[PDB]
């Protein structure tokens, strides 16, 4: 039983070394002779880049980042001219844009030009000759025009400090996005925060201190409500409260506690919202001097950055704003006294999100405060690690890439396949396809049947829910709170 | 204006270092809490592993290589410390197996149990609770039982020296498979060829020397036919001719590895034209043309295309293989009459194994032993050459591996898949087949009776001589000449 040895030492090493270079050298050859070639690629991309310029849409994802990193330093590019990179962009009329770009590309000669309804969140896809070229994402009117942009070659590239939200959004989903995203999202976050650094503001935090009646209720929610172990299970401390937490923890070892801010109201995230809101309401309705002063404001999700929210107000004063974290496992910090705070990268995330809410809400003082808060929170973390000689991975309060989280989460695939099956049972139309070649082989009567204006999307405006049939909660005549048996409807593509 | 620096030197490095470990530590957490969890995975996996044992199917790929590597070393295993893998197995009745395993799993309680048409190499898919668990691949009866297996826990795992064919099949497709496969296929080829090395045979090559007339008809194909620059464009020299080429080249400053060439084995990247042309040349160069006979053969599973043997007095002169749609890595030579293309070193090492398997199916025991000797000798030859020259598998030698230089118009897998699907879509041969037992069992016994998995057609990939003329690619007209047969597609039934 004699045997031969194919591959040895260091022959195996020799192969592993040159192998990715050879694979590259081969992909180069493949791109210059296999259809679609690198030139067909370049051609379609410039056709789409022209359309974005024309309708003035907002480009995000890899394409915006690459373009932006390059405006600063071409060496900091995340793409090669061999990259078959997806050009993603935001649009308030996405299905109409899909039909236009699909027509334009078909007319230009290409095949097989196809416009599909993608798996992901209110995104549509354009494929040309079995190759995905771009993705059109629905952005509600309100959100859309509020997005800060940077201009390059007459194209609106989503502000680097806005794209940053989405990158933190990745690191802030440890169970559903650690494998598939944390490697690229860290690498990209690095270059983005290198070429577009976080600003340094010497300006003071000017958050108005509220009245004593309110000031006591905000405090008594922490001391009396959030202490009850059968009540605080699903709560996570966000807002200026959480901000101050990291601000205080930065003192533990030019220019002191001076970064501390007046807490204007509580901002909490619940991983069991409907139960936790009703419970906060009933607690305030018990601890409040004249219960008929209590009012409840609800808000739609802010784009794709938050879920629903509810503000409980006493004399039109916000006491607490509760956010819906249902379906998410939020990375959190543990201390817990004596005789749950959202993670450092989560607060750094919400601060940016809240700054954007302010911008949409037209609120200029809050828009300036969040910006100050971010700068201060970053100054705070840096000086702490400088004084302690620590790292973003050492078990500190400012630790990054946390796996430890609160809440029952579900993988993207699961979330996508379940949502699809729900709307499939509803008959809200599963997959939408547009093949201009096939569409134009059809009569003008059938061609007339297609209307992109008649397309519905989830209301993700961040706007106060006015109409009661869209409100999640109901206030009964006795003054109590109840789960509203409503219609979870949203909005048409008619702008 | 004055900015802050988030992430520095060597803070960026620090992150890149621990990051894949953290991602791993996170995937561990995700695997212990996200439905379906490993406590649902291993349940479904063991149900399928039981079915494979029952019907005695042949497991291949990653799962198979893993367990085989494991039976010799569990440290040299490919899938790591319960890294979720895909079940892939061969079956002569795959659609019936799909319906059985889909029923069994549904009855066992699970949802959503679904059996899809995978859209590949006559492969079918089983998903349970939005998670792909296994893939069933169609293997014709003839091929199926000829596959040498290794038994572990009453399950038939595909012989490592057979799986090797598929791994070489990957490195032998440089334009369509270099990016997506050459990294894993090399790593796996290494660990397979170390835990299951290539045998060492001291036995002599006993290939019978053919008649002086037959050898004369063979030689004149090389001189008078393959020299003509308007004829030899699509030809590639395979078989013992190519084998001998690498045997002679290993001995360049007892040359006993040389073999009698029993006949020419050629691969054409323009087969129908190149076959008719060989036939017509031989019909002119031959003494009495009525002694010329033509034997055709179906593709041998997924290892070859169609073949044609041109025989003079029932003696094989030349066997031509169909390489249409493939870009074969080669080594061009120039006798200066000039151009001669030999199939790459790893391509001959590949066909030798494929030919040894053909012999096994053809029951031919002397050829089954000769190919085995040839492989051993060809490997002995390459090793001793690199030992004498101090060279590597990547240096520009005749025995160079991972070649990019190839002959023939190829098309990317995606293109081949989407075009094949569109061709059968126009034919109405059914695009995507779905089985949802939950939905199927909500239906009446009359509709339930309509579903028959025995009535499923597959491409005839037996490697068998084409007997019936309506399945023959060529026709011999009364005048004695060759013609393209205007026949029907060879779709054998599952039964």
Numbering used by the authors:
A (entry chain A): 9 to 261, 275 to 360, 373 to 528
B (entry chain B): 9 to 261, 277 to 359, 369 to 527
Cite, word for word, the article reporting this structure.
The Mimivirus R341 and M. chilensis Mg561 genes were reliably predicted to encode PAPs after two iterations of PSI-BLAST. The Mimivirus R341 protein exhibits a unique acidic extension of 65 residues at its C-terminal end (D5) and an insertion of 12 amino acids in its third subdomain (D3). The canonical acidic residues D94-E96-D143 are properly positioned and ordered in the crystal structure as evidenced by the 2Fo-Fc electron density maps contoured at 1σ on the of M. chilensis and Mimivirus PAP active sites. To further characterize the molecular determinants of the dimerization of Mg561 and the role of the dimerization on the polyadenylation activity, we made deletion of the Mg561 (ΔD1 Mg561) and R341 (ΔD1 R341) N-terminal domains. Gel filtration experiments revealed that the mutants were monomeric and although they still co-purified with RNA, they were inactive, suggesting that the dimeric state and the N-terminal domain were required for the polyadenylation activity. No association was observed between Mg18 and R341 confirming the specificity of the interaction.
